[PDB]
Design a protein around this ligand. Structure first.
Ligand SMILES: CCCCCCCCOCCOCCOCCOCCOCCO
Length: 772
């Protein structure tokens, strides 16, 4: 809608960057095309399409309007075949904002290389859950989003921690606005599994081996959460929702200029959710606050200061899964889905806060530089108490394990990078050169020396959580871990021919972990990045890539000789085809991929049967593993009012024994989520459905009372979602979400410490949203 503009005549490059900023729109243009040209003056309250054609007056440029993006082109009478993947400079470093796009497909993305690229231009599997997708299906936290992310499987550790797999691996890489956090373990990682979506525009998941921008990390993927940003027009909304099991959510979101000119701009969001659960005596209060201010120091230098805060505060937390698999005498336990082995007072509260500042500067070069400063906190307060072990006994009694972990992780990050174009052999290429530093410091107390506790409960079958709370005693342990990451990276994107784009880059990494454990060090480790994209038609491109990653091992993972295993490492080999339709409104991708892991930690059963080094009592073995698999996806417009996100993923991951592994992650999965906006009489009704299918999944668990391995199978099952919204009013709308329509009873965990967890039964959510 009508925006306040003030772009005086200047280098067309600068004007377009200035335009993107003022218009809250992503401008994409070609550097060689705008380099010898200037904008004409625009001033005053204008609609952005009126504004841009006015700005482009005299330049010979055309505008392609595409959602929250505009691409500028300068057509010639010549042209010998179009350079679809031509180097393009961009006004927003993080990509296209999805908020208001009305789409389930992203516009442009920087998750791969820092370079702002379309999914079609990216030689990696990149899925995105867009703002609209999130709104439509009421995906209100990262757990919700993951569950709806094609190619991801969400499994439960416990009531307050989920696992996200991709391609055989737990994902343990989280970024915020393209900045990695430290996720060495749940110490550093509190709250990552729980982020509320109220503050985010989209989550982008980069599958494979993502060392280039993550640095040290897990295989599988990176989850990159892009924060909402301030807008140049005032706008906001209040949201209210009510769902099954006393699930209440409220939300506020306010954005706009804070001065008459618009040179300081802010966005604030507050969200609160208090919910019970299908699980007995489990409740959780979550709170989020977020403020961000953008100050324009001048036309081409912006300072951003922001803070965020999320508290996740549950009662009846489990330690491991909802119930034990086997009773005292070896039979499978058969319990309702409402069973919760958590004690009433058991709580794994997790909290997170960020304070962050950026400085962004556009150089009249068409280059941009950006400094990102982060202070992050991941805190936990975890007095846990849960039935665990082989229970009940015949007399229907059980025993509780109780331990308390409190702690905080303080983190500091500096990221500086420079990105821009450059001529070489007559053609335009682009480059990112960057450097990064993070220091993160974990400090905690643990308590396991319970003083005078009677940890037995008299009634398992009617377990309520109604057990006493122990005297925790004095601290049993003081955590003091310190992780230091230093990185330097460079990626070039050479426009080799009119259809060929070659990506060559890498990261050099310095990783130090210091504290109570023997010091872990890796210096000057090189992480290569090699990719190619070949254009086939106006529509299809093929791409191939070789990417890598490592994670220095947990310090308990030592070997036969008490030497720390070499870092857990992997390369992803990928070849595939990407299609782009309707001017980027619909994307399809088909990929074959292979992850070769090496130095994957493993028990070492032959040593461990009778240790022979007094030095180590429980060594680990560092083996190779492989993931073979393929993936198909589609997202975007299928017809005018009709959006989808869908995916198909096949995987098998075997280790150096040849045995299948991550067998709780199904070998085959399908996701399809769709919504349809009607026209004419009922153009105010959005109707929507979704399905998730997954094939066989199983776990080998040991039945202690019978001294034997058992197989726990989860037969293939569907989950069906349904969704409807009515825009009753310009400013007010109502929604219903029904999840798991057929009330499929299934498991999200079998075998995590000999326990099991159910997935959500049929639940509803009703919401109204009020836009000012
Ligand atoms: C050093 C710590 C950093 C703290 C950062 C906290 C930032 C909190 O800022 C919240 C302000 O957000 C502004 C909300 O935007 C609404 C603008 O509308 C104001 C009134 O509108 C006038 C008429 O349109």
């Amino acid at each position: 809608q009508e925006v306040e503009f003030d772009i005086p005549p200047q280098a067309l490059g600068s004007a377009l960057q200035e335009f993107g900023r003022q218009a809250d729109i992503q401008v994409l243009y070609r550097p060689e095309e705008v380099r010898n040209k200037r904008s004409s003056a625009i001033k005053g309250k204008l609609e952005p399409n009126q504004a841009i054609t006015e700005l482009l007056r005299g330049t010979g440029a055309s505008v392609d309007f595409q959602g929250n993006a505009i691409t500028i082109s300068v057509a010639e009478a010549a042209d010998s075949s179009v350079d679809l993947g031509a180097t393009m400079i961009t006004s927003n470093q993080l990509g296209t904002i999805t908020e208001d796009s009305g789409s389930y497909t992203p516009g442009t993305i920087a998750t791969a290389t820092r370079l702002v690229l379309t999914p079609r231009e990216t030689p990696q599997s990149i899925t995105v859950v867009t703002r609209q997708n999130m709104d439509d299906f009421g995906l209100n936290n990262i757990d919700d989003v993951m569950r709806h992310t094609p190619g991801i499987t969400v499994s439960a550790y416990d009531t307050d921690r989920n696992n996200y797999y991709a391609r055989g691996f737990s994902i343990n890489n989280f970024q915020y606005d393209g900045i990695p956090s430290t996720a060495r373990n749940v110490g550093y990682s509190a709250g990552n599994t729980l982020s509320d979506m109220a503050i985010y525009d989209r989550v982008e998941v980069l599958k494979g081996a993502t060392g280039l921008l993550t640095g040290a990390g897990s295989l599988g993927a990176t989850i990159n959460l892009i924060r909402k940003k301030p807008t140049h027009e005032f706008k906001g909304h209040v949201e209210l929702g009510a769902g099954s099991w006393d699930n209440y959510r409220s939300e506020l979101d306010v954005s706009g200029p804070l001065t008459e000119s618009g040179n300081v701009r802010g966005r604030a969001v507050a969200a609160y959710q208090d919910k019970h659960s299908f699980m007995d005596h489990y409740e959780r209060k979550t709170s989020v606050y977020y403020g961000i201010l953008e100050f324009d120091l001048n036309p081409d230098t912006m300072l951003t200061v922001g803070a965020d805060y999320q508290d996740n505060d549950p009662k009846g937390s489990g330690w491991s899964g909802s119930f034990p698999l086997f009773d005292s005498q070896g039979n499978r336990n058969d319990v309702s889905r409402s069973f919760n082995n958590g004690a009433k007072w058991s709580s794994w509260e997790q909290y997170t806060r960020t304070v962050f500042a950026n400085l962004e500067h556009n150089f009249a070069n068409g280059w941009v530089g950006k400094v990102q400063l982060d202070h992050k906190i991941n805190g936990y307060h975890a007095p846990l108490g849960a039935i665990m072990g082989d229970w009940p006994a015949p007399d229907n009694s059980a025993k509780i394990v109780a331990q308390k972990y409190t702690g905080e992780t303080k983190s500091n990050s500096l990221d500086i990078y420079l990105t821009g174009p450059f001529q070489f052999l007559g053609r335009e290429h682009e480059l990112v050169v960057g450097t990064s530093a993070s220091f993160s410091h974990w400090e905690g107390k643990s308590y396991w020396n319970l003083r005078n506790y009677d940890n037995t409960t008299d009634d398992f079958i009617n377990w309520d959580g109604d057990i006493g709370k122990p005297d925790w005693g004095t601290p049993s342990q003081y955590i003091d871990d310190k992780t230091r990451q230093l990185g330097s990276y460079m990626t070039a994107r050479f426009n080799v021919t009119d259809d060929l784009n070659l990506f060559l880059g890498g990261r050099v990494v310095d990783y130090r972990v210091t504290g109570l454990n023997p010091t872990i060090r890796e210096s000057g480790r090189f992480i290569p990045y090699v990719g190619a994209v070949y254009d086939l038609n106006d529509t299809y491109s093929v791409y191939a890539s070789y990417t890598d990653i490592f994670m220095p091992q947990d310090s308990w993972y030592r070997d036969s000789s008490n030497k720390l295993l070499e870092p857990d490492e992997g390369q992803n080999y990928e070849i595939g085809i990407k299609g782009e339709y309707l001017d980027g409104r619909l994307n399809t991708s088909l990929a074959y991929f292979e992850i070769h892991e090496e130095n994957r930690a493993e028990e070492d059963a032959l040593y461990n049967s009778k240790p022979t080094n007094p030095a180590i009592t429980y060594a680990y073995k560092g083996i190779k593993a492989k993931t073979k698999g393929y993936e198909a996806e589609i997202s975007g417009e299928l017809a005018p009012g009709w959006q989808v996100q869908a995916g198909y993923t096949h995987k098998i991951i075997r280790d150096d024994s040849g045995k299948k592994v991550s067998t709780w992650e199904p070998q085959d999965q399908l996701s399809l989520y769709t919504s349809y906006k009607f026209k004419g009489a009922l153009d105010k009704l959005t109707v929507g459905g979704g399905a998730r299918w997954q094939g066989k999944s199983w776990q080998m668990v040991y039945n202690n009372p019978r001294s034997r391995w058992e197989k726990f199978s989860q037969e293939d099952y569907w989950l069906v979602d349904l969704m409807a919204r009515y825009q009753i009013t310009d400013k007010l709308s109502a929604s219903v979400n029904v999840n798991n329509v057929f009330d499929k009873t299934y498991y999200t965990n079998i075998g995590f410490y000999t326990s099991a967890s159910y997935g959500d039964p049929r639940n509803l959510m009703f919401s109204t949203r009020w836009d000012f």
